[PDB]
């Protein structure tokens, strides 16, 4: 499964492996639950080239602060361990595929 669970301790190691799309969220979130099945569709559609890295902002304020994340769901596209793009809020799988594609 392409989807992984990380913290500030592991985030950089996980995001080093190619294009990775991190999901700054928290289980207390509402809108994040809408995009979760879209990330499962992304496992099913991009998991050959993509990794998806969920990170719980309620325990990872430092990593959130690293990019000024102040709302969720927030999406950080990293490539080879550094941020390459950002997006905020819900997006459909096609728009997310394009957001990945522009850095593949």
From Swiss-Prot:
Keywords: Disulfide bond, Electron transport, Redox-active center, Transport. One of its GO terms (biological process) is cell redox homeostasis. Residues 2-104 form the Thioredoxin domain. It holds the Pfam family Thioredoxin. One of its GO terms (molecular function) is protein-disulfide reductase activity. It comes from the Bacteria. CDD domains: TRX_family. GO terms for cellular component: cytoplasm; cytosol. Disulfide bonds join 29-32. Belongs to the thioredoxin family. Participates in various redox reactions through the reversible oxidation of its active center dithiol to a disulfide and catalyzes dithiol-disulfide exchange reactions. This is Thioredoxin. It comes from Bacillus subtilis (strain 168). The lineage of its organism: Bacteria, Bacillati, Bacillota, Bacilli, Bacillales.
